Design a protein around this ligand. Structure first.
Ligand SMILES: [Zn+2]
Ligand SMILES: [Zn+2]
Length: 430
C-alpha cells in the first residue's frame, strides 16, 4: 500500500498524486518545536483510492474534512488514514483538510536527523529524505512532487521564509502571517520553511533568454563575519547552468543563510544554507539541484546519485565556465574515490544514499559519458534528460534507456560501466 521505496518501504501511499498543499502553519515560539497546522491537500490518483494515507510523525490530528464534509479518519504511529465516502478515481481530484498540532519528531544511517529543526531561535525544515511528515501531513516521497501555498504565522518580532513567491504580510494581535506560493512542483523535502529572526534582501532580476528569474536571499541574525553571496555570482551561475540544462525551473532563486552548522539543502528556489556550508561549490551544487532533484525527482531513494551526482558534476561544468581545468577537477575527485570503498550507483542500503559514491562516482559517471560523446552531444543530452523527466520521476534504468536511445549503444555501455560493478573504473580521460 506504501509507495514501495526500496530504501524507505513504509513511506507514501501507492498511487496517490498530491497536486497541491495549501498549508497554514503557526509557530508560536521560533526555536521551539511546537506548532499547529491547517492544511488542505488537493489530491488526484493514478489508481482508485478508497482511502487517503498520509505520512505524519509527531503532531496529533484534531479534525479532518473531505471536500468540505466530515470524514472518517484515524491516526496511527506514522500515518493519518482517511476513509473516503467513495473511491477517488484517476482523473478526479478532491480536497483533504487536516487540522493538527503538537511536536514534530525527527537513525544512524543518515548524515542528519531530518525534519523540523529547532536551534538558536530558529525553526526550519531540513527534511531530506523523509522529515517533512514531522510538521506536514504529506505523501512524503519524491515520486510525488507538488506545488505549495504556505501561510506562516509567527510572533510579530519574528519573520518567516518559505519556498515560493512572497506576496503578503499581515499583522494582527501581535501575530504576523506571511504568504508564499511555490508554483512549480517539487518534492516535499524541497519545501523550504524557516521561521525566526530573518530578513529578505533582493537583487536585480536575472534575464535569461527564455525567462526572468527573480533574486532574493534570506539572512538570519547571528551570521559569522564574512557570510555573503558574492555580488552577481548567482546570475552567472544561473546563466551557465541554464545554458547546460535548459531553462531554470522556478521563478526565483536565492539562499537562506543561517548561523547554524549543518548541510545545505536545495529547498525550492531558496536553498537552506547553514553558514558553515556557504562555499562557492556548495552554492553551485544547491542551485544545480533545482534541476536535478527538485524538477527531475527520484522515483526511488536508491537512485540519489541521479540528484547528488548530477549536482556535483554541475560544479565541474561551473568551474570550467570560469576558466578552470575540468579534467584536473575530475582527477582530484577520482584520487579521493580511489582510497575509499566503491559500489554500484544504485544504493542497496540507507547508509549509502548520501555517501561518497552517490556524489563523486555519480559525477564521474557523467564525466565518462561526456568524454565519450563530446560536449555538444552531452549538452544536448542534458537538455533532453531534463525535458524527458519533467513531470515524471527518474530512475537509473530509465536514464540508461534514454542514453541508449539518444546517444547510442556505445554511450550507454560507457555509462553502464560506471553505474554497475563493485570496483571503481579507471579515471575517465580524453
Ligand atoms: Zn504530485
Ligand atoms: Zn546535494
Amino acid at each position: 500500500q506504501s509507495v514501495g521505496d526500496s530504501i524507505f518501504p513504509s513511506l507514501g501511499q501507492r498511487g496517490l498524486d498530491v497536486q497541491h498543499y495549501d498549508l497554514h502553519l503557526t509557530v508560536p515560539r521560533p526555536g521551539e518545536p511546537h506548532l499547529s497546522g491547517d492544511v488542505t491537500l488537493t489530491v488526484g490518483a493514478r489508481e482508485p483510492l478508497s482511502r487517503i494515507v498520509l505520512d505524519l510523525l509527531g503532531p496529533r490530528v484534531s479534525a479532518a474534512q473531505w471536500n468540505g464534509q466530515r470524514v472518517r479518519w484515524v491516526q496511527t504511529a506514522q500515518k493519518v488514514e482517511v476513509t473516503l465516502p467513495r473511491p477517488l478515481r484517476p482523473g478526479e481530484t478532491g480536497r483533504l483538510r487536516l487540522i493538527y498540532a503538537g511536536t514534530p519528531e525527527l537513525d544512524p544511517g543518515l548524515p542528519i536527523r531530518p525534519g523540523w529543526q529547532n536551534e538558536a531561535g530558529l525553526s526550519y525544515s531540513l527534511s531530506e529524505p523523509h522529515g517533512t511528515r514531522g510538521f506536514l501531513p504529506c505523501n512524503d516521497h519524491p515520486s510525488d512532487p507538488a506545488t505549495f501555498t504556505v501561510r506562516v504565522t509567527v510572533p510579530a518580532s519574528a519573520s518567516a521564509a518559505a519556498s515560493g513567491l512572497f506576496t503578503t504580510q499581515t499583522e494582527r494581535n501581535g501575530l504576523k502571517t506571511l504568504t508564499f506560493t511555490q508554483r512549480v512542483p517539487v518534492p516535499t523535502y524541497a519545501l523550504g520553511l524557516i521561521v525566526g529572526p530573518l530578513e529578505r534582501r533582493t537583487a536585480p532580476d536575472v534575464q535569461l533568454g527564455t525567462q526572468t528569474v527573480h533574486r532574493r536571499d534570506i539572512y538570519a541574525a547571528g551570521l559569522p563575519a564574512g557570510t555573503t553571496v558574492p555580488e552577481g555570482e548567482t546570475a552567472r551561475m544561473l546563466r551557465v547552468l541554464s545554458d547546460w540544462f535548459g531553462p531554470y525551473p522556478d521563478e526565483v532563486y536565492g539562499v537562506a543563510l543561517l548561523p547554524v552548522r549543518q548541510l545545505a539543502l536545495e529547498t525550492a528556489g531558496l536553498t537552506t544554507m547553514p553558514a558553515t556550508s556557504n562555499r562557492e561549490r556548495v552554492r553551485l551544487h544547491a542551485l544545480a539541484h533545482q534541476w536535478f532533484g527538485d524538477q527531475v525527482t527520484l522515483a526511488d531513494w536508491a537512485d540519489t546519485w541521479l540528484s547528488e551526482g548530477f549536482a556535483t558534476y554541475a560544479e565541474l561544468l561551473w568551474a570550467e565556465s570560469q576558466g578552470e581545468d575540468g579534467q584536473a577537477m575530475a582527477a582530484d575527485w577520482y584520487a579521493r574515490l580511489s582510497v575509499l570503498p566503491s559500489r554500484p550507483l544504485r544504493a542497496t542500503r540507507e547508509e549509502e544514499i548520501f555517501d561518497a559514491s552517490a556524489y563523486f562516482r555519480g559525477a564521474l559517471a557523467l564525466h565518462a559519458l561526456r568524454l565519450k560523446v563530446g560536449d555538444a552531444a552531452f549538452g544536448q543530452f542534458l537538455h533532453s534528460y531534463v525535458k524527458t523527466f519533467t513531470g515524471r520521476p527518474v530512475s537509473t534504468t530509465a536514464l540508461l534507456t534514454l542514453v541508449k536511445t539518444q546517444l547510442g549503444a556505445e554511450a550507454e555501455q560507457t555509462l553502464r560501466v560506471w553505474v554497475e560493478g563493485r570496483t571503481l573504473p579507471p579515471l575517465p580521460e580524453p
